[PDB]
Amino acid sequence: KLTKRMRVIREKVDATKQYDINEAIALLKELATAKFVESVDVAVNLGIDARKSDQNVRGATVLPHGTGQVRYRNDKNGIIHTTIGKVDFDADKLKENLEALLVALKKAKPTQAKGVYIKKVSISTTMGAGVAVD
Amino acid sequence: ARIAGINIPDHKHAVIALTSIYGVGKTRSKAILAAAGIAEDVKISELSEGQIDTLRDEVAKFVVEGDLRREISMSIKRLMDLGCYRGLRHRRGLPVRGQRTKTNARTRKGPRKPI
RNA sequence: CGCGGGGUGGAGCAGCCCGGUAGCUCGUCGGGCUCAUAACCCGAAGGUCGUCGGUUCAAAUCCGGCCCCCGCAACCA
RNA sequence: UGAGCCUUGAUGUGUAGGAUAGGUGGGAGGCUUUGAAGUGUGGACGCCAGUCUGCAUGGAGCCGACCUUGAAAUACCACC
């Protein structure tokens, strides 16, 4: 069923367990496997669900590294799927980019929000697997 | 196609297109084509919008379109101001010729209305 | 005060979850069938759903605010 | 035997459109004799439609950035 490309991707990423940013971004840079330059795809699930109307968030962020001005809006399943920048960008810079997005997200959090704000934070590339961030 | 009148006649049999034009009946259509001389039995070839130029001037002798409507409006407003029985039927949406109102006056009064 | 339920045609009740533009029951009015009445049958009208916002291509439907009613629990200036 | 929940596949049919357009993002490359649409064929969602699926045939082509369309390829990666 799975092709050799997909089985080697799941051999490279063991997503059943969580990872810290330094290891996660190293995996992302080694996950960069395509003819064309890929773009980082964010995979962050929020405990808060935009299913409550007042808990919706609209925000903006300017990134010095760039992608550099990005916008974001929560969907109904309460998930965040943005792009911090291109994959060839250095890991340490990419780690600062995602960190600034996360700090803006904490400002975006409403008081009405109940339970964990950020349920899980994960990273993936165009065809890459999801690596959890700690 | 277009004519001197504001409304535009359809491209089809010339007599039928004129019947459709407001103010000009089928018989009046035949009156001006008798003067114009344009019959449908002539060569269909060489037919153009330029040809109706003669139609523009001859129809203008007959009040049609807006001119007739203005006449209809002045005739009915006079009826209303006169205070005559004819005007009153116009005001109440009732038969204006003496037709029975008890039954069969739907076209004048309108849809059936519950008691 | 906390939690749960309800308000939709004159009335009553669905539809709600799982958004797809709203029905039924009974009544009303008109006709039919019958010697007549009921039953029955046909047609018609009636609210866009307690209200107000948000969301969305779109809300009775989903999430809040408010009003009223109800159930249970809570209440040592 | 119920619930939470891990994983695997399966499963979405308001509609102009080709069709069985659930929400979002990266996103013109995925795929490929080691078998492209499709066939036989066995079932599934079954709304009886699009797909998937034990094996074989086909011998390489598929999704199209064309249209339609709030909304696009639903090609490619995750969750609900």
CSV table of C-alpha atoms (C1' of nucleotides) in Angstrom, one decimal:
chain,number,residue,atom,x,y,z
A,1,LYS,CA,0.0,0.0,0.0
A,2,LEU,CA,2.5,2.7,1.2
A,3,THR,CA,5.2,3.6,-1.3
A,4,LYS,CA,9.0,3.6,-0.6
A,5,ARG,CA,9.0,7.4,-0.3
A,6,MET,CA,6.2,7.3,2.4
A,7,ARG,CA,7.6,4.3,4.3
A,8,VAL,CA,11.0,6.0,4.5
A,9,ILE,CA,9.3,9.2,5.7
A,10,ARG,CA,7.6,7.3,8.5
A,11,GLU,CA,10.9,5.6,9.2
A,12,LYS,CA,12.5,9.0,9.6
A,13,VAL,CA,9.7,10.4,11.8
A,14,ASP,CA,8.4,8.5,14.8
A,15,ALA,CA,5.4,10.8,15.6
A,16,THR,CA,4.0,8.5,18.3
A,17,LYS,CA,6.2,10.4,20.8
A,18,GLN,CA,6.9,14.1,21.5
A,19,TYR,CA,10.0,16.0,20.5
A,20,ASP,CA,11.7,19.2,21.6
A,21,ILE,CA,12.2,22.1,19.1
A,22,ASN,CA,16.0,21.5,18.6
A,23,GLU,CA,15.4,17.8,17.6
A,24,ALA,CA,12.1,18.6,15.8
A,25,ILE,CA,13.7,21.3,13.6
A,26,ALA,CA,16.7,19.0,12.8
A,27,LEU,CA,14.1,16.3,11.7
A,28,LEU,CA,12.3,19.0,9.6
A,29,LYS,CA,15.6,20.1,7.9
A,30,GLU,CA,16.3,16.4,7.2
A,31,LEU,CA,12.7,15.9,6.1
A,32,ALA,CA,13.3,18.5,3.3
A,33,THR,CA,13.1,16.0,0.4
A,34,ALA,CA,11.6,17.5,-2.8
A,35,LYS,CA,12.7,18.8,-6.3
A,36,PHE,CA,11.2,22.2,-5.3
A,37,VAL,CA,11.8,24.3,-2.2
A,38,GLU,CA,9.1,23.5,0.4
A,39,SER,CA,7.3,25.8,2.9
A,40,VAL,CA,7.0,25.0,6.7
A,41,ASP,CA,3.3,24.0,7.5
A,42,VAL,CA,2.3,24.7,11.1
A,43,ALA,CA,0.1,22.0,12.9
A,44,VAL,CA,-1.0,23.4,16.3
A,45,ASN,CA,-4.3,22.2,18.0
A,46,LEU,CA,-5.9,24.6,20.6
A,47,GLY,CA,-7.9,23.2,23.6
A,48,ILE,CA,-10.2,26.2,23.1
A,49,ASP,CA,-12.6,25.6,20.2
A,50,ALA,CA,-13.8,28.5,18.0
A,51,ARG,CA,-17.1,26.7,18.4
A,52,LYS,CA,-17.9,29.2,21.1
A,53,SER,CA,-18.4,32.5,19.2
A,54,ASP,CA,-16.7,34.9,21.5
A,55,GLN,CA,-13.5,32.8,21.7
A,56,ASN,CA,-12.6,33.5,18.0
A,57,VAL,CA,-9.2,35.1,17.4
A,58,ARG,CA,-7.9,37.3,14.7
A,59,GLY,CA,-4.3,38.4,14.6
A,60,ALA,CA,-1.3,39.5,12.6
A,61,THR,CA,2.5,39.1,12.9
A,62,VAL,CA,5.5,40.6,11.2
A,63,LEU,CA,8.5,38.2,11.1
A,64,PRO,CA,12.1,39.6,10.8
A,65,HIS,CA,13.1,36.3,9.1
A,66,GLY,CA,10.1,36.6,6.8
A,67,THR,CA,8.3,33.8,4.8
A,68,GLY,CA,7.3,39.3,5.9
A,69,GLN,CA,3.8,39.9,7.3
A,70,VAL,CA,1.5,37.0,7.9
A,71,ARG,CA,-2.2,36.7,9.0
A,72,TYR,CA,-4.1,33.9,10.7
A,73,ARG,CA,-7.7,33.0,11.6
A,74,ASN,CA,-8.9,30.0,13.7
A,75,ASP,CA,-11.2,27.5,12.0
A,76,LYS,CA,-14.2,25.6,13.5
A,77,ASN,CA,-12.1,22.5,14.7
A,78,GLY,CA,-9.9,25.0,16.6
A,79,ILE,CA,-6.6,24.3,14.7
A,80,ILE,CA,-3.7,26.6,13.6
A,81,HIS,CA,-2.2,25.9,10.1
A,82,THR,CA,0.0,28.8,9.1
A,83,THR,CA,3.6,29.0,7.5
A,84,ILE,CA,6.6,30.5,9.3
A,85,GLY,CA,8.8,30.5,6.1
A,86,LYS,CA,10.7,28.5,3.5
A,87,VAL,CA,12.4,25.2,4.5
A,88,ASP,CA,15.9,26.2,3.5
A,89,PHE,CA,15.9,28.8,6.2
A,90,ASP,CA,18.2,27.9,9.1
A,91,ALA,CA,16.8,25.9,12.0
A,92,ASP,CA,17.7,28.4,14.8
A,93,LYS,CA,16.1,31.3,12.9
A,94,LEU,CA,13.0,29.2,12.1
A,95,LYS,CA,12.8,28.4,15.9
A,96,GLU,CA,12.7,32.1,16.7
A,97,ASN,CA,10.0,32.7,14.0
A,98,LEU,CA,7.7,30.0,15.5
A,99,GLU,CA,8.5,31.3,19.0
A,100,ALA,CA,7.3,34.8,18.1
A,101,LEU,CA,4.1,33.3,16.5
A,102,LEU,CA,3.5,31.4,19.8
A,103,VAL,CA,4.0,34.6,21.9
A,104,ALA,CA,1.5,36.5,19.7
A,105,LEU,CA,-0.9,33.5,20.2
A,106,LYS,CA,-0.7,33.9,24.0
A,107,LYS,CA,-1.7,37.5,23.6
A,108,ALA,CA,-4.5,36.4,21.2
A,109,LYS,CA,-5.9,33.9,23.9
A,110,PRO,CA,-9.3,35.1,25.4
A,111,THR,CA,-10.1,35.0,29.1
A,112,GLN,CA,-13.3,32.9,28.4
A,113,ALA,CA,-10.9,30.1,27.2
A,114,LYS,CA,-11.2,27.2,29.6
A,115,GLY,CA,-8.6,24.3,30.0
A,116,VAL,CA,-5.2,24.2,28.2
A,117,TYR,CA,-4.8,27.0,25.7
A,118,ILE,CA,-2.4,25.2,23.3
A,119,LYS,CA,-3.3,21.5,23.5
A,120,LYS,CA,-0.4,20.4,21.2
A,121,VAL,CA,2.2,22.2,19.0
A,122,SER,CA,3.4,20.3,15.8
A,123,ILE,CA,5.5,21.0,12.6
A,124,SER,CA,5.3,19.4,9.1
A,125,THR,CA,6.7,20.3,5.6
A,126,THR,CA,4.9,20.0,2.2
A,127,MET,CA,5.1,16.2,2.2
A,128,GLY,CA,6.7,15.8,5.7
A,129,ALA,CA,5.2,14.0,8.8
A,130,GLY,CA,4.0,15.9,11.9
A,131,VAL,CA,6.7,16.3,14.6
A,132,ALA,CA,5.5,17.5,18.0
A,133,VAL,CA,7.2,20.5,19.6
A,134,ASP,CA,8.1,20.8,23.3
B,1,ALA,CA,-34.5,45.7,-35.5
B,2,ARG,CA,-35.7,49.2,-34.2
B,3,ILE,CA,-38.4,51.6,-35.4
B,4,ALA,CA,-39.2,55.3,-34.8
B,5,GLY,CA,-41.1,54.2,-31.7
B,6,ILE,CA,-39.2,53.7,-28.5
B,7,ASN,CA,-39.9,49.9,-28.4
B,8,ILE,CA,-37.9,47.7,-30.8
B,9,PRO,CA,-39.7,45.4,-33.3
B,10,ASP,CA,-38.4,41.7,-33.6
B,11,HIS,CA,-36.6,40.4,-36.7
B,12,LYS,CA,-39.2,38.2,-38.4
B,13,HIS,CA,-42.2,38.7,-40.7
B,14,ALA,CA,-42.5,42.5,-41.1
B,15,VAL,CA,-46.3,42.6,-40.6
B,16,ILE,CA,-46.1,40.5,-37.4
B,17,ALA,CA,-43.2,42.7,-36.0
B,18,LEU,CA,-45.4,45.8,-36.4
B,19,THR,CA,-48.5,44.2,-34.8
B,20,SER,CA,-46.3,43.7,-31.7
B,21,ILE,CA,-45.3,47.4,-31.7
B,22,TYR,CA,-47.6,49.4,-29.3
B,23,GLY,CA,-50.2,51.7,-30.8
B,24,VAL,CA,-50.0,50.0,-34.2
B,25,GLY,CA,-52.5,47.2,-34.9
B,26,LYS,CA,-52.4,44.5,-37.6
B,27,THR,CA,-54.7,46.6,-39.8
B,28,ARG,CA,-52.7,49.8,-39.2
B,29,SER,CA,-49.5,47.7,-40.0
B,30,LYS,CA,-51.1,47.0,-43.4
B,31,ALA,CA,-52.0,50.7,-43.8
B,32,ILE,CA,-48.4,52.0,-43.7
B,33,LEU,CA,-46.9,49.1,-45.7
B,34,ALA,CA,-49.4,50.0,-48.4
B,35,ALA,CA,-47.9,53.5,-48.3
B,36,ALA,CA,-44.4,52.3,-48.0
B,37,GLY,CA,-44.9,49.6,-50.6
B,38,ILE,CA,-42.7,47.1,-48.8
B,39,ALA,CA,-44.3,43.7,-49.2
B,40,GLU,CA,-42.9,40.4,-48.0
B,41,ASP,CA,-43.1,38.8,-51.4
B,42,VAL,CA,-40.3,41.0,-52.8
B,43,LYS,CA,-36.6,39.8,-52.9
B,44,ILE,CA,-35.6,38.8,-49.3
B,45,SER,CA,-32.0,39.7,-50.3
B,46,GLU,CA,-30.8,43.3,-49.8
B,47,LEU,CA,-32.7,43.8,-46.5
B,48,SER,CA,-31.1,46.2,-44.0
B,49,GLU,CA,-31.9,48.6,-41.1
B,50,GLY,CA,-31.4,51.4,-43.7
B,51,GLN,CA,-34.7,50.3,-45.4
B,52,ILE,CA,-36.9,51.2,-42.4
B,53,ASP,CA,-36.0,54.9,-42.9
B,54,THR,CA,-39.2,55.4,-44.9
B,55,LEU,CA,-41.0,53.6,-42.0
B,56,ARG,CA,-39.7,56.2,-39.5
B,57,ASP,CA,-41.3,59.2,-41.1
B,58,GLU,CA,-44.7,57.6,-42.0
B,59,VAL,CA,-45.4,56.1,-38.6
B,60,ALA,CA,-44.8,59.5,-37.0
B,61,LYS,CA,-48.1,60.7,-38.4
B,62,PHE,CA,-49.9,58.2,-36.1
B,63,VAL,CA,-49.8,58.9,-32.3
B,64,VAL,CA,-48.2,55.7,-30.8
B,65,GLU,CA,-46.1,54.5,-27.8
B,66,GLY,CA,-45.8,57.4,-25.2
B,67,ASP,CA,-48.0,59.9,-27.2
B,68,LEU,CA,-51.0,57.5,-27.1
B,69,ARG,CA,-50.4,56.7,-23.4
B,70,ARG,CA,-50.3,60.5,-22.6
B,71,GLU,CA,-53.7,60.7,-24.4
B,72,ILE,CA,-55.1,57.7,-22.4
B,73,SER,CA,-53.9,59.4,-19.1
B,74,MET,CA,-55.5,62.8,-20.0
B,75,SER,CA,-58.8,61.0,-20.9
B,76,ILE,CA,-58.9,59.1,-17.6
B,77,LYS,CA,-57.8,62.0,-15.3
B,78,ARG,CA,-60.5,64.2,-16.9
B,79,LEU,CA,-63.1,61.4,-16.2
B,80,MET,CA,-61.9,61.4,-12.5
B,81,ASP,CA,-62.2,65.3,-12.2
B,82,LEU,CA,-65.5,65.4,-14.0
B,83,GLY,CA,-67.5,63.5,-11.4
B,84,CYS,CA,-69.2,61.4,-14.0
B,85,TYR,CA,-70.4,57.8,-13.6
B,86,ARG,CA,-67.9,56.7,-16.2
B,87,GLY,CA,-65.0,58.2,-14.1
B,88,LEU,CA,-66.3,56.6,-10.9
B,89,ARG,CA,-66.1,53.1,-12.3
B,90,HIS,CA,-62.5,53.8,-13.2
B,91,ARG,CA,-61.7,54.9,-9.6
B,92,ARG,CA,-63.4,51.9,-8.0
B,93,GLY,CA,-61.9,49.3,-10.4
B,94,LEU,CA,-65.5,48.4,-11.5
B,95,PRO,CA,-67.0,47.8,-15.1
B,96,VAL,CA,-67.0,51.1,-17.1
B,97,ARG,CA,-69.5,50.1,-19.8
B,98,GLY,CA,-72.5,48.8,-17.8
B,99,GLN,CA,-71.6,45.0,-17.7
B,100,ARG,CA,-73.2,43.1,-14.7
B,101,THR,CA,-71.2,43.4,-11.4
B,102,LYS,CA,-73.1,40.6,-9.7
B,103,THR,CA,-71.2,38.0,-11.6
B,104,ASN,CA,-68.6,37.8,-14.4
B,105,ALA,CA,-66.8,41.1,-13.6
B,106,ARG,CA,-63.5,39.5,-12.5
B,107,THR,CA,-61.3,41.3,-15.1
B,108,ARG,CA,-62.4,44.6,-13.7
B,109,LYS,CA,-62.6,43.9,-9.9
B,110,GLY,CA,-59.5,41.6,-9.8
B,111,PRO,CA,-58.8,38.3,-7.9
B,112,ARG,CA,-61.6,37.0,-5.6
B,113,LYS,CA,-61.4,38.6,-2.1
B,114,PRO,CA,-62.7,36.8,1.0
B,115,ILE,CA,-65.8,38.5,2.7
C,1,C,C1',-26.3,31.0,43.0
C,2,G,C1',-25.1,26.3,40.1
C,3,C,C1',-26.9,22.7,36.5
C,4,G,C1',-30.6,20.8,33.2
C,5,G,C1',-35.3,21.5,30.2
C,6,G,C1',-39.0,24.6,27.5
C,7,G,C1',-41.1,29.0,24.4
C,8,U,C1',-42.5,27.5,16.6
C,9,G,C1',-50.2,29.0,12.7
C,10,G,C1',-56.0,30.5,17.0
C,11,A,C1',-54.2,26.5,20.1
C,12,G,C1',-51.1,22.4,20.5
C,13,C,C1',-46.9,19.7,18.8
C,14,A,C1',-42.7,18.3,15.7
C,15,G,C1',-38.5,19.5,13.0
C,16,C,C1',-32.8,21.0,16.6
C,17,C,C1',-28.8,16.7,17.7
C,18,C,C1',-26.1,15.8,12.5
C,19,G,C1',-27.4,24.2,9.5
C,20,G,C1',-30.2,22.8,3.7
C,21,U,C1',-35.5,26.9,4.6
C,22,A,C1',-40.6,25.1,8.4
C,23,G,C1',-44.4,20.8,8.7
C,24,C,C1',-48.3,18.1,11.1
C,25,U,C1',-52.6,17.7,14.5
C,26,C,C1',-56.9,20.3,15.8
C,27,G,C1',-59.6,24.7,14.7
C,28,U,C1',-61.0,28.4,10.9
C,29,C,C1',-63.1,29.7,5.8
C,30,G,C1',-64.9,27.9,0.9
C,31,G,C1',-66.5,23.7,-2.0
C,32,G,C1',-67.9,18.6,-2.4
C,33,C,C1',-70.5,13.9,-1.0
C,34,U,C1',-75.7,13.0,1.6
C,35,C,C1',-82.9,13.7,1.8
C,36,A,C1',-80.0,16.0,5.9
C,37,U,C1',-76.0,15.9,9.7
C,38,A,C1',-71.5,13.8,11.2
C,39,A,C1',-67.4,11.3,9.5
C,40,C,C1',-64.7,11.8,5.2
C,41,C,C1',-62.6,14.4,0.9
C,42,C,C1',-60.5,18.7,-1.8
C,43,G,C1',-58.7,23.7,-1.9
C,44,A,C1',-57.3,28.1,0.9
C,45,A,C1',-55.0,31.2,4.7
C,46,G,C1',-51.9,31.4,9.0
C,47,G,C1',-46.0,31.7,12.0
C,48,U,C1',-39.8,31.7,9.1
C,49,C,C1',-39.8,29.8,14.8
C,50,G,C1',-39.7,34.5,22.7
C,51,U,C1',-36.2,38.3,21.7
C,52,C,C1',-31.0,40.3,20.3
C,53,G,C1',-26.3,39.7,18.4
C,54,G,C1',-22.3,36.8,16.5
C,55,U,C1',-20.8,32.6,12.8
C,56,U,C1',-21.4,31.2,7.7
C,57,C,C1',-22.9,30.5,1.0
C,58,A,C1',-26.7,30.2,4.2
C,59,A,C1',-29.5,29.6,11.2
C,60,A,C1',-35.9,27.2,14.1
C,61,U,C1',-31.1,24.3,13.8
C,62,C,C1',-24.9,26.5,16.1
C,63,C,C1',-22.7,29.6,20.0
C,64,G,C1',-23.5,33.5,23.4
C,65,G,C1',-26.7,38.1,26.0
C,66,C,C1',-31.6,39.0,27.9
C,67,C,C1',-37.0,37.8,29.5
C,68,C,C1',-40.5,34.5,31.4
C,69,C,C1',-41.7,29.4,33.4
C,70,C,C1',-40.2,24.7,35.5
C,71,G,C1',-37.1,20.6,37.9
C,72,C,C1',-33.1,19.5,41.5
C,73,A,C1',-29.1,21.1,44.3
C,74,A,C1',-26.7,25.5,46.9
C,75,C,C1',-27.2,30.1,50.4
C,76,C,C1',-23.7,32.2,58.4
C,77,A,C1',-23.1,40.6,56.3
D,1,U,C1',-20.7,-5.3,28.4
D,2,G,C1',-20.3,0.5,28.5
D,3,A,C1',-17.1,4.8,28.4
D,4,G,C1',-12.5,7.3,27.6
D,5,C,C1',-8.7,6.8,24.3
D,6,C,C1',-4.1,4.6,20.8
D,7,U,C1',-3.7,2.9,15.9
D,8,U,C1',-5.3,1.1,10.8
D,9,G,C1',-8.4,1.5,6.8
D,10,A,C1',-13.2,3.0,5.7
D,11,U,C1',-16.8,7.0,5.8
D,12,G,C1',-19.1,12.8,4.0
D,13,U,C1',-24.5,12.6,-2.0
D,14,G,C1',-27.5,21.8,-0.9
D,15,U,C1',-25.1,22.8,-6.5
D,16,A,C1',-24.1,25.3,-11.0
D,17,G,C1',-20.2,21.0,-12.4
D,18,G,C1',-17.5,15.6,-14.6
D,19,A,C1',-18.5,14.0,-9.9
D,20,U,C1',-20.3,11.4,-3.6
D,21,A,C1',-16.8,20.7,-3.4
D,22,G,C1',-17.1,18.0,4.9
D,23,G,C1',-13.3,22.9,7.7
D,24,U,C1',-8.1,24.8,7.1
D,25,G,C1',-2.8,25.4,5.5
D,26,G,C1',1.8,23.9,2.6
D,27,G,C1',0.6,22.7,-2.2
D,28,A,C1',2.5,21.2,-9.7
D,29,G,C1',4.1,17.8,-8.1
D,30,G,C1',2.3,12.8,-6.3
D,31,C,C1',2.3,8.4,-9.1
D,32,U,C1',4.9,4.8,-12.3
D,33,U,C1',6.7,-2.3,-15.6
D,34,U,C1',9.3,-3.0,-8.9
D,35,G,C1',2.3,-2.4,-13.0
D,36,A,C1',-1.6,4.6,-15.2
D,37,A,C1',-7.0,5.1,-16.3
D,38,G,C1',-9.6,0.9,-16.8
D,39,U,C1',-11.2,-4.7,-16.8
D,40,G,C1',-12.6,-9.5,-14.5
D,41,U,C1',-13.9,-9.9,-9.7
D,42,G,C1',-15.3,-10.0,-4.3
D,43,G,C1',-17.7,-6.9,-0.7
D,44,A,C1',-18.4,-2.0,1.8
D,45,C,C1',-20.5,3.3,2.5
D,46,G,C1',-25.0,1.8,0.3
D,47,C,C1',-28.0,7.8,-0.7
D,48,C,C1',-26.9,3.1,-4.9
D,49,A,C1',-23.6,7.4,-6.8
D,50,G,C1',-18.1,8.2,-6.1
D,51,U,C1',-14.3,5.4,-4.5
D,52,C,C1',-11.7,1.7,-1.9
D,53,U,C1',-10.4,-3.4,-1.8
D,54,G,C1',-7.6,-10.7,-2.3
D,55,C,C1',-5.3,-11.6,-7.0
D,56,A,C1',-4.6,-11.3,-12.2
D,57,U,C1',-5.0,-8.8,-17.0
D,58,G,C1',-3.9,-3.3,-19.4
D,59,G,C1',1.4,-1.6,-20.5
D,60,A,C1',1.8,4.4,-18.3
D,61,G,C1',-0.8,7.1,-17.6
D,62,C,C1',-3.8,9.7,-13.7
D,63,C,C1',-5.2,14.3,-10.9
D,64,G,C1',-5.0,20.3,-14.7
D,65,A,C1',-2.9,25.0,-12.9
D,66,C,C1',-9.2,24.7,-18.9
D,67,C,C1',-14.6,25.6,-17.3
D,68,U,C1',-18.1,25.3,-13.4
D,69,U,C1',-17.9,27.4,-8.8
D,70,G,C1',-19.1,31.8,-1.5
D,71,A,C1',-15.3,28.2,-1.7
D,72,A,C1',-10.6,24.1,-6.2
D,73,A,C1',-8.8,20.6,-7.6
D,74,U,C1',-10.8,17.0,-3.5
D,75,A,C1',-2.9,16.0,-7.2
D,76,C,C1',0.5,16.4,-2.7
D,77,C,C1',0.7,16.4,4.5
D,78,A,C1',-1.8,16.5,9.5
D,79,C,C1',-6.3,16.9,12.7
D,80,C,C1',-11.5,17.1,13.6
